[PDB]
């Protein structure tokens, strides 16, 4: 206290085996805000919203829906990825020629700055343009609340361990909704919405980042 939210542990072995999440000096959380329809040149490589975070839902090579994300005084955000760029809080790598399946900016853990300091997981992380890019191939749709949501290329999966049956892996979307697993990992296909489950991380939750599995432990 410095309030500790919890701990991420890399199963099977800054780049460390263990990452403590602490309440930040200043809130860095973000929340969805204004939605923009933007025209993009064929050569577009990055989109950025001046002074803000954003998620880009690519509709075609000509147009992208850009959801602006503004300051959230009530949360802290932590990012996990294979990238060593400054937006990544916790660097994770895969557990002659080597390949990685882990995304540069893989996920966000977002923690309430006030009691009970609930932690929640979201697929994807914001890059150095403070942007998350969902390309034409990525699954994207409008949810029952009318907001745009999407899956990353490979997905972020979570299992809360376990009347009756043992824990099941679910896919988490970019906006933190819960879906059943796709038919195959990386399938160009979205699973079934699980309305009765949430992206709240419970003690002992496993997070599959496609190349590494993390364990969340509440403080």
Sheet holding 53-58, edge to edge: 29-39, 63-72, 53-58, 131-134
Exposed/middle/buried for 96, CB within 10 Å: 0-12, 13-18, 19+? exposed
Cβ neighbours of residue 194 closer than 8 Å, sequence gap 6 or more: 170, 178, 179, 180
Which residue, 167, 119, 157, is CA-closest to 7? Answer: 119
Residue 37, both tokens: 């329809």
Resolution in A: 1.8
Which residues are registered as beta bridge partners of 38?
Answer: 64
């Amino acid at each position: 206290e410095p309030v500790k939210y919890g701990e991420l542990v890399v199963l099977g072995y800054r780049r460390k085996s263990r990452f403590a999440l602490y309440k930040r000096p200043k809130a860095n959380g973000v929340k969805p805000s204004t939605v923009h329809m933007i025209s993009t040149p064929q050569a577009s490589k990055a989109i950025s919203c001046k002074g803000q975070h954003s998620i880009s839902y690519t509709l075609s090579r000509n147009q992208t829906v850009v959801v602006e994300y503004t300051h959230d005084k009530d949360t802290d955000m932590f990012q996990v990825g294979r990238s060593t760029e400054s937006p990544i809080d916790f660097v994770v790598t895969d557990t002659q020629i080597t390949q990685s399946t882990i995304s540069r900016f893989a996920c966000r853990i977002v923690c309430d700055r006030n009691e009970p300091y609930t932690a929640r997981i979201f697929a994807a992380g914001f890059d150095s343009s403070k942007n998350i890019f969902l390309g034409e191939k990525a699954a994207k749709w409008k949810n029952p609340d009318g907001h745009m949501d999407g899956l990353t290329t490979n997905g972020v999966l979570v299992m809360h361990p376990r009347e009756s049956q043992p824990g099941v892996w679910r896919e988490i979307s970019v906006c933190g909704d819960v879906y059943t697993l796709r038919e195959t990992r990386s399938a160009q296909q979205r699973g079934k919405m699980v309305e009765s489950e949430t992206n709240v991380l419970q003690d002992g939750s496993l997070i599959d980042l496609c190349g590494a599995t993390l364990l969340w432990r509440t403080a």
